[PDB]
Symmetry: D2
Subunit: 483 residues, 4 copies
């Protein structure tokens, strides 16, 4: 009571659960929702990236709609330089994933040399870098009603600021282009952790991305970005082929009526939760913070409601890439997400996730849901999960516990990819593998304990749930008290 919105947590109805929400009930220290940040001129710097990690960044998203492979290579180097500067203290080290966002079948403008419009759309490539208030270039070859309205820069253009390489939307380009082929091949070379595939329209599109990543990138998680009507209508087949989903609201809000976007968002988040696959809510969550240090009330509400919807990650696309207040934007998402995680009606969520879950003979699945139930019974400070591939941690997150899921791994890629799942706080263990299997299992558990104690996830008198295996397929649950 008076903490973690626990009074609201015990209500017999969702209506009373709302009525008991208390701004004076402080949340726990731990924050479950992963934060993805688009890197750009305002945040490419190593000094900024270090502070962005401390502010809550978990995934660095690189939009390959602009920039050369050389440019992104230096960005990744800076990201990894900032990340590895905390490796001197493995208790406080934070794994940071690198995400590749494809250009996709996008129609883009050219370079300004931005300008304020209060316009001849050329297709001659001599203006492919000479665009401005009067000139503007376009890249769609198979282009040609008289053509009434053309939406530029996420439908912004009415006058405004027209930047370089802005987007154009027409509510037959290939799913993956050769330029796309290159970027993922480059992403495989740079050992990125995940791929954000733009404008995925069908399941065949997802299979093409996987073939390109091939055996070399077989562990690269493919997150399909639903940005248009076709993606929504074929969502089920896209989700089955993908490792996760991004609700790309920017383009989606242009391709489909703006008043329907919340329907598509809640549909995809629900189905991803139902499938136990990660879902990302993206774009314009804190749009005004590009120029202002404080978000609007609608922006604060959007982030909170995305977490309440069940989103695994929330994104900043330009608030961190080019805005004037990148650190504040990340901190705001951290603050809002933590408050919203406490406001989740876990009583109903856990019940429906279980009732919608299949009866299986898999010991790990039964063990994971048992750990989540136990963590509710004792209001656990954490669920510690030992995992090599991440699956054990993913299975716990799918049942959406209140307590944070501390995944201990020796696999760095597994550690970085874990950010895709709500509640997984990955820790990279660096102690040598013990020759005795039980002692190596135990060794990683004490590692998770020390991180949780140091970060303030739990204290003396709390209780934690520990998930391990029994043979050299995690099937062992231990309820141990925190010293």
């Amino acid at each position: 009571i008076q903490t973690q919105q626990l009074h609201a947590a015990m209500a017999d109805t969702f209506l009373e659960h709302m009525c008991r929400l208390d701004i004076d009930s402080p949340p726990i220290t731990a924050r479950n929702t992963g934060i993805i940040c688009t890197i750009g001129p305002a945040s490419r710097s190593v000094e900024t990236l270090k502070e962005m990690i401390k502010s809550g960044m978990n995934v660095a998203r690189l939009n390959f709609s602009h920039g050369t492979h050389e440019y992104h290579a230096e960005t990744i180097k800076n990201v990894r330089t900032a990340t590895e500067s905390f490796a001197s203290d493995p208790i406080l080290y934070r794994p940071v994933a690198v995400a590749l966002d494809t250009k996709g079948p996008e129609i883009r403008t050219g370079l300004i040399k931005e300008v304020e419009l209060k316009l001849k759309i050329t297709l001659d490539n001599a203006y492919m870098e000479k665009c401005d208030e009067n000139i503007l270039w376009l890249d769609y070859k198979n282009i040609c009603e008289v053509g009434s309205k053309i939406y530029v820069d996420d439908g912004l253009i009415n006058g405004g600021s027209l930047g370089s390489k802005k987007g154009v939307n027409l509510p037959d380009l290939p799913a993956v282009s050769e330029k796309d082929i290159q970027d993922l091949k480059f992403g495989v070379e740079q050992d990125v952790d995940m791929v954000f595939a733009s404008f995925i329209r069908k399941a065949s599109d997802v299979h093409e991305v996987r073939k390109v990543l091939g055996e070399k990138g077989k562990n690269i998680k493919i997150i399909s970005k639903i940005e248009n009507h076709e993606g929504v209508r074929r969502f089920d087949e896209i989700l089955e082929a993908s490792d996760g989903i991004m609700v790309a609201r920017g383009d989606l809000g242009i391709e489909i009526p703006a008043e329907k976007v919340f329907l598509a968002q809640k549909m995809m988040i629900g189905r991803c939760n139902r499938a136990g696959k990660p879902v990302i809510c993206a774009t314009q969550m804190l749009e005004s913070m590009i120029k202002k240090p404080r978000p609007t009330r609608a922006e604060g509400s959007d982030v909170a409601n995305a977490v309440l919807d069940g989103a695994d990650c929330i994104m900043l696309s330009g608030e961190t890439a080019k805005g004037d207040y990148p650190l504040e934007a990340v901190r705001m998402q951290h603050l809002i997400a933590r408050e919203a995680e406490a406001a989740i009606y876990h009583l109903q969520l856990f019940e429906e996730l279980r009732r919608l879950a299949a009866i299986t003979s898999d010991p790990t699945e039964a063990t994971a849901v048992g750990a989540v139930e136990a963590s509710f019974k004792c209001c656990s400070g954490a669920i510690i999960v030992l995992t090599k591939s991440g699956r054990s941690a993913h299975q716990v997150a799918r049942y959406r516990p209140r307590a944070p899921i501390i995944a201990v791994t020796r696999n760095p890629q597994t550690a970085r990819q874990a950010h895709l799942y709500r509640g997984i706080f990955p820790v990279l263990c660096k102690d040598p593998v013990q020759e005795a299997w039980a002692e190596d299992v135990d060794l990683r558990v004490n590692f998770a304990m020390n991180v949780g104690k140091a970060r303030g996830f739990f204290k003396k008198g709390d209780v934690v749930i520990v998930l391990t295996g029994w043979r050299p397929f995690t099937n062992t649950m231990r309820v141990v008290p925190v010293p």
Copy 2:
């Protein structure tokens, strides 16, 4: 199926309800959420007000934080002039409420260069002198700014500085009066102008609500008092404030500065839930479509904000600068209309009705049992409307508290009742002007047929559809005891 998100309506779980939301499931024609629009330079004209009414406006909010009584009088005149221009056709006539928003215990600025519409661009790091000398009351600019509560400050972030703007001192315990002398005058002016409701700013306690009611006196005893919760004290004392008030406004603008911005959604959802639980109107207000002040399309967060407020259970949604001073007031009104309809169809009515009854007390009031019976019957047959004859509005309010999917066509001869009905989700008020028939049954039928004709013309239903009709057995207020499931004639 395939319509009004009815596939999502039949889900056994809220998770499956989310999974079944369909962007290709078109909503019904009727829109249940009331729309309140702040009137200002962008919307004072009769021509604009005419288009704002057609675009979906139900309540006109006049902020007395700025402007003279003379100025506001012409605003009310224009609102009523635009409203009465549709009175030549009572089938499509739309009652429009007038709302008075008090200044309250506000720290406000003054006129930029002697003009309310004038603005200045402040730059980061600039120096600004805050003055209390009334020689700058009407002469504020990028260098000097007068206030009604001198200080040399810097600009931690610049922007457009307009006239009669707000100032906030978080974390403190201000000593400004709940009702000021200026508030008393504005409140008396509102009683004289026959406004329908008062939005009382910065209500911190129940004593505040009672003082506003005393000023409204006997002449304004029927003026609805909506307490604006804008600060820490208002949230902590919400139950006693709600008990004293006729309704509640989540005034997120000031609330988002007074309390941490990341906590505002908690206070919003708490208050909407408690008003829903109490059956009193609740308004979600401010910055819902802020970007539409300068842009013709809202941001994705703003579209989400309106939808979720409706899903939260808000009776009304508000527009401030988007309609008072923005460049796209009609589009902002139309955007709220479009989103509200979509979100109204996405409500999980199965669970909502379920909790509303269980949280409702067993009463011997025949009107209450009749209202909840009408809502159940409207769910059973997916009725096109619940027609309610009401004199004071009470009968219609009791139906709205149980949140039916179908629109509530409240028929009244009382114009003030017609205007105030906009405060409740789903009440579509129609002002009947026909003479009272001496035979009660024929007077009842006359008003029922009036709602029928409105519903047909509006595309709510057609002949052969099924509607729920709530009437009384004796003329007057308090005898609503008859529920009929009738085919449209």
Copy 3:
């Protein structure tokens, strides 16, 4: 809250609902579960039948497995003589239905002593060897003797025959079934209990016998064997109602499984809104004792909690020594169990399982039931000609009694099949003014309810009528005058 277990009614969980059941919370006067009594030598007299009506009897069951048409004709005469002796006072008159229980496709055989392990050679069912295989079981005399045609005595001892699991091909209607059924049409019975219904085609054959003259006679299919349970859905769709004939069912299927079939059929009938009867041995010990056993009290109560519209008495009233007490016991327990129903969950699930239809009568009925819960109504008064409007209300299982007012005597008698319908037969002439005819019939329900103690002046009741001088679509929440 101290009455009708209303404290238990407000529990948020069924477990807490159980925890709040209070032996000191008295039930209401009205009793909702219909009571069906088999009439026989112990209850045939006019004087006894009068006391049985006063004690709660709603339906008189005549088992045509025994007795001649002459005998049953005199039984019906006595039932109607006792019933009609209260007709001089329509406030205290109780419509009493007459039910014909068919012999059906029955297999029949001093005494002889059978020994365990001995062999028996079977030599009136001429087609048994084609429906039983080597190793099949045969049960004789209410399951007393069991055999395994060269049979082996599995259970010995010193009549009716059951072939469990076996697909018996005997005709649905026998020649004497046709004659008995035709006799029932001649005697103007209200309902038929069709024994050993195995498939939907069986129900259609019974309906064929009743013809146009008995087109309004309700057919209650008796589920008595494995095939009937396995084909229940098609049987229920074809029938007007269902009887859980536990006597024979307990022989045809393992006795430990009978409760599964009972709760299955009651649930499915509740889901369809069709009457269901729980029958046989409910108070069996009261044949010889004036008080029931604890198991028998529990059986009656749990049948009501299951959702059965009626409970039945067989030997307890046909041949036992305490028929009045057996009827009174069922009346008392049913009332206690009706107050112990978790109406919060029941009403919730009945609506969710109900289809969204554009039928005004359906919307009116569920709206009336919802309103009756909101104001703790003393009754739901329904004016009805066919009973349909009253049946639609009963399917949503309100706590309050449903006073169905009708001028149709058959409608009044058949209404007893539905939980909660208290039928009253209005006999006043139709008034030329429509509204005065409605008011006359509503005030009749008013006076009946007041006299029976269902409510008093100033209480609140729900009234269901029509709006123009042909379908019930008007609900009024009125104080009792």
Copy 4:
């Protein structure tokens, strides 16, 4: 879906759950509801008791309302002789508990002269307190043993078969119901405030005798208040501090004071016989469902007793009402069901035990576990006790994989008790080296106790595995599960009680 009523288990509503119950859906082999049998002339023999164990008996109930200490001692000897004759095979051995049922504050009549008299309806009977007629009870005069009788009355004899209506050191009544009046029959004064002691001198004598004979539990008759339970515990003292005290709720006061009685007791018995005389018979089902619900809510054992299969005293098959009564008691949530005359004096004791076993198994599959487990959690308190979190986590896991068993290592039984309170579908195989723990476990729904007799292994971890494999072998032999199935295994991290914190989801070896 075709077994254990699993289709009905997945219904979104209890109504649909009813609609999906399938007589062709066979239950699992395991039977969770404990069976208590009253021992008497029909069942005292070692040979009969042997068959009673094989037919399903878990608890032998000895009614000390009759019989000498010598008599009951020989019954206990036969029970243990019959029980230990299966110890030659520890895989199939079944621990059998011995339960002492007290006489309590009982009012009994005098002696007639198998002599009995026929009381006739409408006739008159005089109640006398004069000890001269203590062995001269006839059709007109009847003696009893209650000192302050005529004061607390302004009457029911022989289990309520005979009912009297008083008309006046004496009393004049009129026979409301006739029947046969034997010697030392029982008398009920419904509602009247009886001042008889909770524990009598005879009760103290029997209770001390039970400690000497090492009984596992006491069925305390006519518990009216918590002070009564406390008096029973005082008599049992430190020597019998581990004897479970089961309070029998048989009267109005016990129901009204149930919460305080339940708090003081180890369990509760719904003694429907006397309760059905003390309160109106039509209300007994209310008191049954209240007490079972509250015992389920408190996590303490509850027994449904008396007349469950009454007709089987003379008949080899039960009535349809009796079969329903057994099933519905299990559906209510009763941990154990009881037989009284059906096994003590009836002609078909074996069949009565077999029928209860059969019905209970069928009813256990028909429980709506979705709603039951859900409410048990919501009504359960958030605690920092690791054993509590481990228990509810294991049960949740057991539903997820439809486990063949939940194997629990326990010395005192507590770990196994905490699992049973959440009512899993799967049986709880409690492995113990404590024979008293094995016998007392029968009080809890679903706990199948197995008494391990292997020597303690020198390596503690190997001793744990030995006991887990023992449970595996028991489950294999009883047909609870087979190789390749999945079971939940509950153990501790340290030796000794109170360290059960480890849940393993393992395939059967």
